[PDB]
Amino acid sequence: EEDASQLIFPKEFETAETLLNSEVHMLLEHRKQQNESAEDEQELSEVFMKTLNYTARFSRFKNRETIASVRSLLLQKKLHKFELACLANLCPETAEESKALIPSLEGRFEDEELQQILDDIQTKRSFQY
Amino acid sequence: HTTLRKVTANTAIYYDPNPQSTVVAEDQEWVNVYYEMPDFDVARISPWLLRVELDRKHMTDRKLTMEQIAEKINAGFGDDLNCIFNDDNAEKLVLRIRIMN
Amino acid sequence: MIIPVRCFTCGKIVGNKWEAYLGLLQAEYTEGDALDALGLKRYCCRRMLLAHVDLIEKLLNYAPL
Amino acid sequence: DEITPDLWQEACWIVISSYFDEKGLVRQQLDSFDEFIQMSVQRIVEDAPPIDLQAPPRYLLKFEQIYLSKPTHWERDGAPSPMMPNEARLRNLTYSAPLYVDITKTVIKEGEEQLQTQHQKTFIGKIPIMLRSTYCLLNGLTDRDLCELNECPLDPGGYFIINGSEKVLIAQEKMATNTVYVFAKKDSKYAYTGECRSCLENSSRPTSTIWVSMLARGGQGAKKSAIGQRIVATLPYIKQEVPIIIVFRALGFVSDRDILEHIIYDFEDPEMMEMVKPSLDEAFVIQEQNVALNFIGSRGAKPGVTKEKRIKYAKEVLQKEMLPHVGVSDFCETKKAYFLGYMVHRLLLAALGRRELDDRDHYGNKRLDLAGPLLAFLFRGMFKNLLKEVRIYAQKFIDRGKDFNLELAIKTRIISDGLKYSLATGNWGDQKKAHQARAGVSQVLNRLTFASTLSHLRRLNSPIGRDGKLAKPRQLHNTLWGMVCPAETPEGHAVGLVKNLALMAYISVGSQPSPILEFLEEWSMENLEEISPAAIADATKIFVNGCWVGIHKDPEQLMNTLRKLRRQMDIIVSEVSMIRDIREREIRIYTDAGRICRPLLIVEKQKLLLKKRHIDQLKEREYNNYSWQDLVASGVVEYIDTLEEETVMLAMTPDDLQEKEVAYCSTYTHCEIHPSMILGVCASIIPFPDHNQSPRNTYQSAMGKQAMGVYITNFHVRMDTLAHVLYYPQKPLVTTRSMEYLRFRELPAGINSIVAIASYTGYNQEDSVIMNRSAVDRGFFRSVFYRSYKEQESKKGFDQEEVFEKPTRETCQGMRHAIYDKLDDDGLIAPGVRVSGDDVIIGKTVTLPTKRDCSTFLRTSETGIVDQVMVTLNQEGYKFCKIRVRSVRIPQIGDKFASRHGQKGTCGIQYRQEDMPFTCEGITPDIIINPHAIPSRMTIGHLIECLQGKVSANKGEIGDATPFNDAVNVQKISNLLSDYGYHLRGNEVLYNGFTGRKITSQIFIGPTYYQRLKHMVDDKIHS
Amino acid sequence: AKQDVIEVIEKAHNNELEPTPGNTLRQTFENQVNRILNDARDKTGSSAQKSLSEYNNFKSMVVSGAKGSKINISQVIAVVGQQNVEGKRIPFGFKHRTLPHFIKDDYGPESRGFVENSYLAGLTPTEFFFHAMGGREGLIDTAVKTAETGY
Amino acid sequence: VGIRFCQECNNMLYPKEDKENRILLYACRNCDYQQEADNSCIYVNKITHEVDELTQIIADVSQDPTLPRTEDHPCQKCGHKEAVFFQSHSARAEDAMRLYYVCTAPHCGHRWTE
């Protein structure tokens, strides 16, 4: 009865704020650091390790400054919170790609203005090489 | 909708030490008679100028007049600056703008 | 790959004419003159000989199993 | 003496014949790879940073030289047996050659005693070798030898065999480097863009791009409005946009006058001076150079904690990160500033409108990356990771104090698998690196037809990303004339993105600019460091690969001398191109690779340099030690690129330049050999394309590739998943001169047909056609079909393994209902056994922890006979076999037939010879097409080709299909036909087969060439 | 038509041409030249329609209106016509010249893509490329037209 | 409209006005050196920018082979019949259509418009 394309999902998640894959890696790193050294506890669960690799492999940003800049840039617009992380995580190359991948954006975003947003994300995301 | 850019030909900022100097030779003939009346001359006037020329061809198409252009500049911007217009019959239209006294 | 047995249009035999066609070409005869000697009055049959390629010559270069 | 116009037609085609005989059709593929494997590979190893290991014990490892051997196969025995290219395809293994590198290590243990050891030919890895390249096993071999190796002599090669799959590196167009471009974008906050991506020679560091933008006047502010428009430059490692003026201060030009000297060359002109005034206001407060360095470092990516660190970071960024190509050392401040000032100067001209904005689609601004340049970038990815693996492996060894053996340090898998991965998958770059690979590269070679194979090798790809998106790659530009075929383009959403190289055009392989740089010094050329800025106002700027070599006092004399050297094959190679921007006093010399250019006859004083004697030698080109290269040596013909073609005048034919009643142009510099060369491989085979509509020519390009025919000669030996071979591939009655070079005459992909254009029984609509049943029974369009089935028995698991044997009902528990008598005692069906429907052709079982049947059945229900069976061992050493199932497809009502031009037409109905409309002489047309197609979705060339075919067959001479030959005309063809007792327009009286009464309308019948498309009904229904 | 275009070019070259109040000189010149070339195609094309006899097969198709159009016959017999790109004539891909063969800053019929040769007669090498440019635009528009219209 | 540099530090001389002598003098900021301006003009701005293109045309375009050559209009100070002509290359003047003639003589370099 829930669908991400139509922006329908359990009411509990409305209060929650989305997080980026790269940003989550920082939160996982903070959790990893304290567990490893701050306290003597059992080794982290396999689930924690699995998502850490996924976030690191798909991390589109180097430092917090790049993450914060994109978050602030997209916050100025009327972008929905669900689209906030989904757009940044996907990093669509062009406006046409984002709308097809994200049906919600095409409802309230024009073909020109959104293009000026995705290209901004491109200037922020950096390559290891 | 027409702007000053579409009706103006050229603009420059000239320097005149005293109000009667009018370093520009060509406009000295007509500015003198207009400036005889002490309008806004009750006190010192800055030695700067914002003389701007108006294209003759563009004015004819819009049927504009010098008084109409000057009125909007004064009314639109208020009393921050004062503008002086020349005779319409002149081949070249001279519009001199100086900051208000 | 090889010259067809007969004309696809009418059915006149053209495979046997290929051997004589090449022999006439090296005999200083013109391309169209050779066709007349073989007896190809129709243009459909002359097509089968004038503009034919014998690809089997290059295939035979490769050694067999 | 001179070439008379009555003889120019034959003379023009003779020089073209020599060009293809020497260069060929895949010279651009081979040349780039040869450069990559000869110099680029050496450069990467030579330019590698020193390897330093520390934890007292210091280890310095350096690579001395690279040795490359011919391809060999390493089996379990390890013997270096030669590996033939054909063996690679059959065994499904990559065709590649070993790579060897010399490693010299110097070790010092703080004992004041330095000793080193020599490692000769270290097995660094291996490099895939393009077929027919310098390192290939089939280079310089006569046609006789190629047949002995089961390789087609007519096959041009130029591809890589990876895992048994032939892959062609599709050229990817990229924006040219070390070039200043000014573009106008209405979406950006700034009016103009000073984009200029700068990179060193071949590649020492990743490409760095800087955008010297100019803020738009739209914004309004208290101070912004006053100064108005100011220039802001964004550094590659600086997030924020810093004023350009401050950059010069960081270089060392503290004085403000020096800033204007480098930017403004003509102080007399006041229009440009006023534009630079606002830029100085922002940077005025920064007067000292140290402050400028401090200012730039403030917004750096990783600002330093201490104040002094900010200056150091800015110093490194400007010195190294910024403008790497102009200078990489620490003593190039003057050179770097001059280039930076030029970028601002270029912006000023565009802003004022005195200089036209650079065209996005201009191919001169775009460079083509071939297998050479592409693989060169890839080779750095593994090599850089190779050092890390050695460093990481030694790191744990070094800290322990014991020496580390190099044999373990060097990783062969990364070098071997790294190149093999992308070349097979098509995803460029390493998969581990967390990015998006560029897909669409290294696609499987299309071997359906020989013409398709040639087109794929010369295929081009439009740029992707921001560059491609902003521009209009799909739209046809004027620069494509003679360089990229205009007609040829795939139809669909990706229309115009994929194109094909022009027949005569080739892409520059690449050369070192050092000989050109040294040449200028001995002449009047003066470097920037020697002269004052005031001397640049009147002189002309000289550029070598985008570098600021220095101005020259007299441009005319130097270029004339430079042109003479190019024609004489002196230190300046004919590949190099010199561009003279007269309106801008700029002389640009480019030597880097990726430049598309085509040959052009040189014209001097309205007279061709190509004389009769040159043609006479060419006529005897064989056994006389004369080739195309001699023509360039004599200076009769040179090469012009897109940028040089900008300022080079051209003449279509000598008749245009010899004399005219009114002189259109009295100064012709070059003359085209023949305009028809603009067409590509697929477009060249079309007669009268000018008579044909543009979409139809584009449509044929797609249909021509889909046409089925003899793709190569060694089809029997090889094994292909899909391969359609025609029973009787016959050369057309109407053929183009360029068809000879394509070798399509030797291996055609169609059969001629006497086509009568009439509406017979109304069984053919606009998209349809009527065939002759009797003709098909004689082999009118029949063709064979080959499908290769491939399987291996590998011991993937210790407990469970695959084996080849007969799956008996008793020993096997799980099985599918099918006939198993076909399989032999070895589990493989022997050649010569008819197979129909669902039948097992190879036996394979898995010994699960009793065995489960996992054999492979026929893909479709078609009835076919196995042609040949091959048993081999894969690269892993496990048994591997391939079998080719051969089936015969008879043309039927569902097959789709397409002419050489127009839309494909399905065979609406098949009629026997009796039912077909016979003429007076008794010639029943083989095929009948709908007349209603001719108007819109067909071309008059079909009627002209029919008229030419009738004359060609009647007169026994192959007609000429030159697109722009004035000799061939419709009226001339009609007159020739009338001499053989036929209607001048080709119309004939056809008697209806059913009713013998004459048809009121006289049908038009002629031998039109036709081709059978791969689309067949049997494949669809059998699925 | 070709002579008339030259006369228009000469008038603009000598500044004799006067722009219309609703348009600029550069756009006005492009409009005048387009009409001369457009009118020639229609006039020559119309004469071609009258040229065809009743027995002629080309006339039968168009007369009944089943397939084809009078413009198609015009491009086959009389003249192909101007090859407009992006709603305008062939742009100056090079510096003020459509192709290298044409002189700099050339605004003539052949230079700007006017195709004066019918399909039957055969197009000149310059015209063939200009014809391809016009056809390429149609294919691109057709490819996107179906995608948008289907949506 | 022009730009002048001081002799001390060779820096921009922004226009400054003094209230004592009532004379506009170009004075540098960082260095105390100041010089008077005799032009009495700070800058000019042509909105229509109808600047003659003759000064912009370079005399070295005579040897250009691509540029058309016409003998109808000879050079004023040479008499040579041959003369290369072309249209304005400035984007600002793209709206207008005009011809500019340049003498074909090797050293004359004369530019004129009819």
Ligand SMILES: [Zn+2]
């Ligand atoms: Zn026959």
Ligand SMILES: [Zn+2]
């Ligand atoms: Zn100073």
Ligand SMILES: [Zn+2]
């Ligand atoms: Zn002169």
